[PDB]
């Protein structure tokens, strides 16, 4: 069903990611230079606050500035509704692409197929530019989003594009702010692949757990310290299924980066994303030998202190003929 009041569609798990990307890009979508994806809780309850508004308005502005794609849940619940509202607001004041994936099974007031109009057991936002529903079946609304969104992100990550330096590749950064366990599972699977994640060290209950982490008894104590009601409700047997995951979160500190709550800088969003992305290139070792791509990447991302301290530093024979092209740029 296609609805306009943006494009809509029904998604099947078996559908190949390459075919979906080809559809998107060829038909309605331009080449992607960045894929900022926000992962949070789909629960209606959210910790709305002025700080939460400020920590996301800058993100939206950066996404527009670089032309990045924004992937979200997109079911008109808390953070997702705010994201849709901010996308609309930016459109009012040269377009933003916001794909929102949800589960078909949960969908209520189903209107099967041709431009049917729906007016109104899952509610869906109508502000997203593109909205996708995926459920091969099981109308009981089981978790199905993870089976397709992660595969799409990984495929786009491997898709090489000769632009924005970064070894002719695409960033594919994950941004975590919600307190849901689904967010924890998404973080685990993303860490499984070569995708750096940045977590907010603020109101997020589970995000605060991960922030404090950076000794299973300490893990249990930290988990108890946050969301005590959920900790008590969960059975003891299932607790293991979480503890191991936390270890995987703390398995590698190279990728995981977090923001400082105390910092009140206006450009903290850009700086954090830039640093987290930069670490992945530095540690990848694919282009670590290459000493010119690093500077070209660091230039586009406004970072003077990092460029001065790391790129040039000392004991490097760049010579006067090394800066020609980068200085021109």
């Amino acid at each position: 069903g296609d609805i306009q009041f943006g494009k809509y569609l029904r998604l099947s798990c078996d559908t190949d990611s390459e075919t979906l990307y080809e559809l998107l890009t060829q038909h309605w979508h331009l080449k992607t230079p960045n894929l900022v994806i926000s992962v949070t809780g789909g629960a209606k309850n959210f910790a709305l606050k002025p700080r939460m508004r400020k920590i996301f308005s800058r993100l939206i502005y950066i996404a527009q500035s670089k032309g990045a794609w924004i992937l979200t849940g997109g079911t008109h619940y808390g953070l997702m509704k705010y994201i849709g509202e901010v996308v609309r607001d930016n459109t009012i004041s040269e377009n933003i692409v916001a794909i929102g994936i949800a589960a078909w099974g949960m969908v209520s007031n189903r209107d099967t197929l041709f431009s049917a109009q729906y007016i109104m057991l899952y509610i869906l936002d109508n502000n997203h530019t593109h909205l996708l529903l995926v459920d091969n079946g099981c109308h009981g609304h089981p978790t199905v989003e993870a089976k397709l969104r992660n595969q799409l992100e990984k495929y786009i990550s491997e898709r090489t594009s000769q632009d924005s330096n970064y070894g002719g590749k695409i960033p594919i950064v994950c941004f975590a702010q919600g307190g849901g366990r689904e967010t924890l599972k998404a973080i685990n699977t993303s860490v499984k692949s070569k995708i750096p994640c940045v977590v907010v060290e603020g109101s997020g209950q589970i995000a605060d757990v991960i922030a404090s982490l950076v000794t299973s008894s300490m893990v249990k104590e930290k988990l108890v310290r946050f969301l005590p009601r959920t900790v008590s409700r969960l059975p003891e047997e299932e607790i293991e299924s979480w503890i191991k995951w936390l270890k995987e979160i703390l398995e590698s500190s190279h990728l995981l980066t977090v923001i400082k709550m105390e910092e009140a800088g206006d450009e903290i969003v850009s700086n954090a994303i830039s640093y987290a992305l930069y670490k992945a290139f530095s540690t990848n070792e694919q282009d670590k030998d290459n000493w010119n791509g690093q500077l070209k990447l660091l230039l586009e991302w406004n970072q003077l202190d990092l460029a001065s301290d790391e790129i040039f530093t000392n004991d490097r024979r760049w010579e006067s003929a090394d800066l020609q092209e980068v200085m021109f740029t």
């Binding site: 569609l9 029904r10 099947s12 078996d14 559908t15 075919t19 979906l20 559809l23 038909h27």
Partner: peptide, 11 residues
């Protein structure tokens, strides 16, 4: 073309 692509995607 769009109809054919939609049909192929649906399978």
């Amino acid at each position: 073309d769009l109809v054919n692509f939609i049909q192929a995607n649906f399978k």
